[PDB]
Design a protein around this ligand. Structure first.
Ligand SMILES: [Ca+2]
Ligand SMILES: [Ca+2]
Ligand SMILES: [Ca+2]
Ligand SMILES: [Ca+2]
Ligand SMILES: [Ca+2]
Ligand SMILES: [Ca+2]
Ligand SMILES: [Cl-]
Ligand SMILES: [Cl-]
Ligand SMILES: [Cl-]
Ligand SMILES: [Cl-]
Ligand SMILES: [Mn+3]
Ligand SMILES: [Mn+3]
Ligand SMILES: [Mn+3]
Ligand SMILES: [Mn+3]
Ligand SMILES: [Mn+3]
Ligand SMILES: [Mn+3]
Ligand SMILES: [Mn+3]
Ligand SMILES: [Mn+3]
Ligand SMILES: [Mn+3]
Ligand SMILES: [Mn+3]
Ligand SMILES: [Mn+3]
Ligand SMILES: [Mn+3]
Lengths: 150, 152, 151, 151, 151, 149, 152, 151, 152, 151, 151, 151
């Protein structure tokens, strides 16, 4: 019930995160494009993997997942802007960092709610996902010359 | 300058984003005999759709353009309509819905071919031809499962 | 670790019988849908086999003695076997696989509880991973039958 | 080895026609089950092609001359072809394949008997292996259609 | 799109006969070069089969009805078949394959033109891709025979 | 007849699977690291015969054993409680013994089907017998012995 | 009859041979930050360029032609100029030079598209189109690295 | 061991030392069983290296600073090394690995409780997976030595 | 019971060993048009000969016998004759010599087949049958290269 | 050619022209044996390309500057090129490849000697590996032509 | 370092330290280029481990006793280790790697010199193959840093 | 080059006999360790065959005429063969594999010495690579037997 609600929140937020990553992939310009351009692709595939798992788990529990663009946009707490080629590489990576931080926090909130309802399966899905998102936070901040700062 | 080629590629970026969301809905809310075949089949169709989306968008970037890249833009520029998920829709109704989405994409890809042909954009022209070919083969197979002719 | 051991061993028995019923369904299946559901019971049996061996080997690791005869499998399992019957419909055969899975999922839930109480987190992970996967199977089976997972 | 050579050539003709009938079912199929049975037709086609080549090549190896034109396939085969038709039901299409397979299985048995008598053990095994796998498909096809194999 | 449907169906028949001829060459080959040219006939067969399925399924897609019996293939095809013969030389065998390929390339060109006039751009592409590859083979086969391609 | 001996094998193959699994689990002594996963390859091959033999019986119009009750009651092999104290040598000699029984059973399967003219079934028993016999050679060799077929 | 198609195929054989030598130089003489990405990337470009050369040369043979097949022939017929290897060229400059060659190649493939179209040689037409497609996509990526639009 | 950052760093030092001990055994082994156990020490070293990298990287992600010099590994580790000796027997070599593994399973449990108390669930899972596998290796190692695992 | 089956198995151990040695000679001393197809082909033949050698020997061990295992036992028990290698033999004659070795082996495998069928050794019977099937097929192809019928 | 660097650079230029000559043989080839020797030219070219890249990168590693224009390749190489000609027989084409391989083998021996004299042992091994496989190829090529290697 | 056995063992010591230093660079790396050079360090580490195992095993094979404790590695190596530091630039990190690799190249020259002198040709090769690839990495690293390799 | 040629052909003869001796060990083996040492004999036979093939072809490439009959192998080889005996223990069989390998490593050293004196550096390299891996196998076989390599 609370588990079901935090899973459906992730469905919406992950759908918007994929969209933002695709924008970064497409509009990227400046030194470093050749390594970071295909890298967004690895990220998008990971994000799709979570989206699928969390949504299907919600179905499995008796819920009804968001499944239209209007529902993703309106329920998600991530905000989107028009694509723009002039944004710098380093500005682009900082933005991925801020999306990833929000997802880490969402997944913690997911861990907590599922733990207090005893839904162990859902609990595990959130923990695995938070684990790899935080490793990516380490790597992105290191590219930018910074500590991870979780 | 390729004004209309660019424009139909962007129309295709929006339309493919919405088509993808509609196949995901079908994939999730599917119930009834034939689930075990058609549930994973939707995975294949989404992957194919994602391929065209990426290729058509990158061709647009390649020509000097600016692809749609936010959910708001996809949804306001697409000619496809979304309704709320519902588990009570039959299998046959689900497949007929995919046929309609595919019939639309095929005619969109046809408009894409004609427009690029006329502007001398052979590369773009070929992307639209390859995509149409495959969407039309799917329409044959889906129609067949439903005991019908392709009626292209 | 007396009760983690007890339930690990219970699983060895129920999973042996669960494997036998899946095999029956695989052999005696008749009706529209056979060609997709026949090889699908193969995938289920292989996954049941994986659990059988991992739970058993965890029980040895903890210093116990796993059930290892058809006799022990029979008298300890709470699953009930009947004679093979070709005249059972496809839908009824899938409903039967649903029952067996629902039972296994409940078992793995107990196993999870007792391991968590006794401080055995290795065995706790084992039970959780296997529950996740069987519950995904129950959704898909019930969807084929036009129904909700109803967990 | 006169009757072994003659029976291999018969198979070359009948397998060529069986191939063509399967191709027709693949193309003209409509209705529920299309998505599983349409590609399944390709698997049978590939399997049929393998027998065709083994049997033909064995006939060559023994100093024979295989049928190698469409006219020869048509006039020497005991199988009958009809015009393609999109209106036939899936269930009718599958029973048509059971029929072709029933004929091939019996032909392969004549193959086995005639070569056992003449002591051509190599040709004997070729027909045995092929009969084994064709009877297995008759079970599965009939099981889909709600029936016993009735070999 | 009346003419596109007809030349697709013509190709179905002619490809079917081309297959049979390639297979006769494969089987009846003798002389220096056998070891290289016998397996090569397999590759051309796999490629001719690819054309046949792609073109037939395009016709179904457009609302047509493919030829699907040996009888229809023989009667509609323009290629003549003859009885198999071991005494034919390697040079003669390869020359015959060249003749068949020249024919198919001329048919694919006509197919290209008709579909172009009618606006069927997908059929246009199938015919073009197939023409490219057959032409390339004619070059290699002619080169083996000591000749320019002479398209 | 052929149907009767196919069903017998279904039964005996199910108990022999259970016995290999026992050896696999309870094994202790020098040679564990090689023989423990070797029992895995044996069970796989045993599972292969089982599935092929049941399916042939279905194909012939038969009705295969499909309960632990039926396997255990129809098999001529006997099971005992698992014991950690058995020796590596004693464990391999049990396997040898189960394999000798299977080779004789497959023999009967060959003779019976051959006399009935069911050649497909005849070949199934022949292939299975060949491989089990090869296994008896190797196991026996590990234990310092001739195959003594 | 097909004399202009032949002559443009052979022109490409000369130009591609020289383009392969220029990529090799860049590969070898490269120095500066980003070397570890861009050095192996020249290898991928070299394999692509080798694929077109061999395909366009064999199509010329298939048509009745006689391809250029000596360094002297390649050098005298190519419109590309070569200079001496120099380690002191910067990374930006090397990447800029590859863009120059890629732009020339894309325009030559376009001319090849045109000529084969006017002669009725649809097979040769296709070979140029497929090659143009992928060279233009590379011009997009390289210019992105350099902070620029594709400017096709 | 104050917190999660502390026990991870401890794991870094102990895994570096355990790797070196396993390499010693790999190199100096002698006696019946060499051909099996010599390569099996590579599998262990690789598994060890795996955990080393996971834990080290989690400590960095968390804002820490892993030990990265031999002196640091040597001084902080609780395991003790001795000069390589060819006159150690196979069985003694195996028992030393068991000793090293038993220490590691204990360090992993400590890391489990400490992370569990802090709410650091990610570090909790990393220590749980590592313990699961180490303990399985102790069952097998002991079984070769004629003993129960005795965890 | 199984003395004769056991005797023919070992006969084959010797013959397969000499046959292997003869193929290695042909492979080494081969000169002439076709070298580049037939030199590697000899390796495929050697690997197939080794396959029968190991299988037939192991079947013998399995039945309680004792396989020949010395070049002396091989060379005295074999019915095949060897001669010094010669570079001046033609391609067509090396291939004809291979043919003769194969003809002998197939006759032997028929003797093996007959002997084993009479003693009710159904396993040994199958091994000989399978080896005969493949060797006879090579005979067809080799004779086809040389412009002849198989003439089994 | 007075040092290791000068012979590497000599090799860069000679390998580039050797590549060009092999490409010409590949393209202008006609006659019996085309089908085996046309794609063999490909394997020869890929191997030549590996030597080129390796010897050039060795030069850079030693502080040199490899030739890197067609002008520089053409002027520094002792190999001569002629216009392509379809009327050259197949056996004549193979003889030309032998001729180029005999030259390359001689160059590599000079490279071996020079580098050995200077203690450039890494360079020395590069020339040795390359000589070995070229010489093997001369053996096979001459064997196709009914001749001893005559190295 | 008077003989082959002693320089091999010095190699065992320095290669263990090399590995520890590369691992540091891997972990403490920060700045533009992190995403390419972080994984590259793993490639170097893996290649160092290979040289370790080969050089160590050769020593054993000749009848010596490899250093096998962190103590022995650290005392016998000529390489210095400092504490981990996130605030080093990418250019400074790759500069440290170069210096380490130059040292290793020079050692392998000593191993080569000493083994040639003693006529142990096997050990000679191992040092030669390892010198080859380390030198190649130096060129690439120096190129990234805008420099000639300056061996 | 006469002596290089002479020792290549001696190797041809010795490697043929070694291959014969290993197959015997493989076949006649009985006792604890059979299951690991029986397949290990296949790996050694394969590596032997590779050496045999390389050394014979190098001889052919040099102008030579390798031994190619069983009689030539038997009478030129310094290895002696004895009748197969199932009673030899596992430890005796491995000791017999050791003696064969000791002879081969020594034969390869004189191959190395002779080709070095004649300046045949390709032949020199082949003997060196072979000696390296054989001597590695002596270490491993002596370890199983609880001994030092004692080269
Ligand atoms: Ca001619
Ligand atoms: Ca013109
Ligand atoms: Ca003839
Ligand atoms: Ca001439
Ligand atoms: Ca001659
Ligand atoms: Ca600083
Ligand atoms: Cl529900
Ligand atoms: Cl910071
Ligand atoms: Cl004993
Ligand atoms: Cl720069
Ligand atoms: Mn999904
Ligand atoms: Mn993309
Ligand atoms: Mn297990
Ligand atoms: Mn064939
Ligand atoms: Mn098809
Ligand atoms: Mn089955
Ligand atoms: Mn080519
Ligand atoms: Mn790492
Ligand atoms: Mn063997
Ligand atoms: Mn390179
Ligand atoms: Mn090692
Ligand atoms: Mn060879």
């Amino acid at each position: 019930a609370d588990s079901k609600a935090v899973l459906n929140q992730a469905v919406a937020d992950l759908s918007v995160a994929h969209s933002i990553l695709h924008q970064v992939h497409w509009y990227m310009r400046g030194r470093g494009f050749m390594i970071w351009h295909p890298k967004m692709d690895e990220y998008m595939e990971e994000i799709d993997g979570y989206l699928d798992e969390m949504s299907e788990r919600l179905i499995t529990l008796g819920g009804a997942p968001f499944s239209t663009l209007k529902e993703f946009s309106e329920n998600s707490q991530l905000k989107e802007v028009l694509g723009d080629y002039n944004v710098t590489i380093e500005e682009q990576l900082a933005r991925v960092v801020e999306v990833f931080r929000y997802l880490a926090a969402l997944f913690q909130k997911g861990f907590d709610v599922s733990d207090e309802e005893g839904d162990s399966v859902t609990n595990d899905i959130f923990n695995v996902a938070k684990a790899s998102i935080e490793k990516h936070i380490w790597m992105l901040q290191a590219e930018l010359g910074q500590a991870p700062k979780l």
